Amino acid sequence: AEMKTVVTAAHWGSIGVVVQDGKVVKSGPAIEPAVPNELQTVVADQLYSEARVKCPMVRKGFLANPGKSDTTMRGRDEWVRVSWDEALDLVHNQLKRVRDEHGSTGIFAGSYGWFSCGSLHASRTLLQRYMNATGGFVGHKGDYSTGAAQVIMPHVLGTIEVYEQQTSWESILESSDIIVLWSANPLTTMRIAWMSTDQKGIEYFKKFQASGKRIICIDPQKSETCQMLNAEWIPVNTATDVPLMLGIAHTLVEQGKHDKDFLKKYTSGYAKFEEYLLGKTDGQPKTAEWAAKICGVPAETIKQLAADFASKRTMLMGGWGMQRQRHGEQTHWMLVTLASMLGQIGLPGGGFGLSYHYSNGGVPTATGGIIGSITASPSKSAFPLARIADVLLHPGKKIQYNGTEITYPDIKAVYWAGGNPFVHHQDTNTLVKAFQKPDVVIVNEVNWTPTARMADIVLPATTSYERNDLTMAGDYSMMSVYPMKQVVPPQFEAKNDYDIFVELAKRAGVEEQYTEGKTEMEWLEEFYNAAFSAARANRVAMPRFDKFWAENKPLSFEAGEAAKKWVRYGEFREDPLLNPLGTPSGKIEIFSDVVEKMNYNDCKGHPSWMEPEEFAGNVTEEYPLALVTPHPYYRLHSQLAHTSLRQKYAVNDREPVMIHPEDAAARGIKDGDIVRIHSKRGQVLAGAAVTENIIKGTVALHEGAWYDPMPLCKNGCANVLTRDEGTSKLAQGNSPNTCIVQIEKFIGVAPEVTVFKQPKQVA
Ligand SMILES: Nc1nc2c(c(=O)[nH]1)N[C@H]1C(S)=C(S)[C@@H](COP(=O)(O)OP(=O)(O)OC[C@H]3O[C@@H](n4cnc5c(=O)[nH]c(N)nc54)[C@H](O)[C@@H]3O)O[C@H]1N2
Ligand SMILES: Nc1nc2c(c(=O)[nH]1)N[C@H]1C(S)=C(S)[C@@H](COP(=O)(O)OP(=O)(O)OC[C@H]3O[C@@H](n4cnc5c(=O)[nH]c(N)nc54)[C@H](O)[C@@H]3O)O[C@H]1N2
Ligand SMILES: [Cl-]
């Protein structure tokens, strides 16, 4: 009777992996979760997939004329298998050429993506570490998650807000009468964390449901969360939450339910905003009736939400889909303004939180220590990252950004390691053109993703299961140190990214700076010991690394009474004169003079409603439906798309698209039919999921399906359809969820999806 389980971890949690005769045969949670997490069950598929990159590969046409090839052959050339020595020499020589001719401002290595958890084997960080050791690189600003909110919140609250600990969930359970999931789908989106999910956020949502208190979901779709918690669904048109919030706010004023004392003491600029709210400026009071016409919520329901939010202790939980769209800055600005008018900020169970849906925000912070991690350190060229296509195509172009002007650099080489821009970036067909501009495109990948398929040189990377690492239970509780013990040796000819970059560093003469003379296990011990020392200072005994590593189990910490009772903005509420915010006024900036003075047409000095170019309110005869692109339940973006989880959602071997029965009937579409979706940007195939769980006039296609072009995507990659434009001049965030489309039934034999097979090689 043998213990055949190795414990490791992923973004989707601590994983127990059963190994039989050197082969992985089962994976699942190392710690029982409140809700099953099927993402944990496919380690074997990840290890043994025929979609894996097996050996270093170079495009035929690039091998023939390196750095001087016909780059329009990217994505459609034959691949040549080469040795590691040949591939690494070629990467080094091609990057050296760019460094010699253009310098670091000719190399883009922002390399946005989620890769895998782990303190050491962080592929993106290891790439940037190599780039810095060899002279530097052009990176980026912001991220795709909160590109808008993370720029406006510093102006409004003096802090980034979206990536900070929330009021304790124990306070919510005890004191909140209502939680409002506004653009938030936590039973989907907390199946993962940036480190490794602690699995407790979903447990807390379940406890809140079981207490019988009110859960309200405001969303164009009746999401997995709304269904699984049997919450009250408020259907809303995508991109019309600001009108809805204005109508609620106007009702508060009309019924004397706003907190005038709070607004005077804790905010700046409320009176100027109220003039807009009441129509004194523009002739149009922002009534519940005015709002109902735009957002699709009946006026009497808007008024009843306002009364209930003010009558009960209410937590407004704002998710991020609604700021991933044109004018996205306005949504969380207005949510904070609404919370200010309700006046419950800083009270137990009250106010707002912008990370209750992300990585277990609000789970009480444990007392212990936090492990270290590798860094990129052994720019005027940096740009808001969703301008990447624009940058690659248009060197020298200038844009406005948060009160400054940015000049695009002139990029000759692109290196990606740990992200999938040909799935994650908007307007895929335009990104194809952008990727024809560089002299050389290099990708480290586990699998033959759409991005790998667009490269010149593809280097096979290992999964987490083929190496040793450490992570934490996260992202806020920090309640455990999770070992990531190697399960099997590297498969095929794959290498850890760390080893790839060690070989490149050696060719550049900087190996010693890159490795600091440490082995894998010496790095891990250094990272662990940071937690050990911090825990000791907190009076928490930990095993030393050798004992922890041998035990190969999560090491757990406990939360104390202070963390269980912690209320965000409690100190500000107690005394705002001595605990002011880091803003110009020391208060919540409902009107921001700093933003006003930027004089941007698409972001004013207070939250406001500005119609976007494409949304439910300006659909056309040609494109009569609106689109939303939520995050998927059975993938982390594009990760795990190639595994057996596909069978849990594919419809007729395509990505499912949610379609309301009346929109489907008007087109002769029945549940299960293949359909063609198209926009001005492109077209995709999808499988119809006909359901009343999407608001009429809108369709939902989850992001992350692998682009499989014929241009027409055979598989259903949502970003083939979306617009590539900045949210506004304030943040220049990405704007996928303001989009209009047409759908028609696909007639005849449908094409086979080929993007999970090995690519075309030479004969
Ligand atoms: N329409 C629309 N578009 C969106 C979104 C949306 O809501 N709607 N969401 C946006 C957001 S919030 C994000 S975060 C992005 C996500 O975009 P990405 O982060 O690019 O998506 P992932 O699928 O997680 O890509 C991670 C890649 O890293 C690889 N990888 C994993 N581990 C390793 C490793 O150790 N080494 C190497 N070399 N590779 C590894 C995986 O094989 C995988 O291809 O998508 C964004 N795009
Ligand atoms: N299982 C899983 N979990 C994940 C991810 C994943 O890919 N898979 N991605 C992770 C990442 S990188 C992030 S950034 C977060 C993303 O966290 P979010 O940004 O919050 O996730 P989304 O699914 O984009 O949006 C949540 C809800 O908002 C809705 N919504 C979209 N637009 C609007 C709007 O205009 N108004 C309203 N009222 N609702 C709208 C969506 O329909 C959706 O149900 O999740 C993380 N967690
Ligand atoms: Cl109280």
Ligand SMILES: [Mo]
């Ligand atoms: Mo994200």
Ligand SMILES: [O]
């Ligand atoms: O992200």
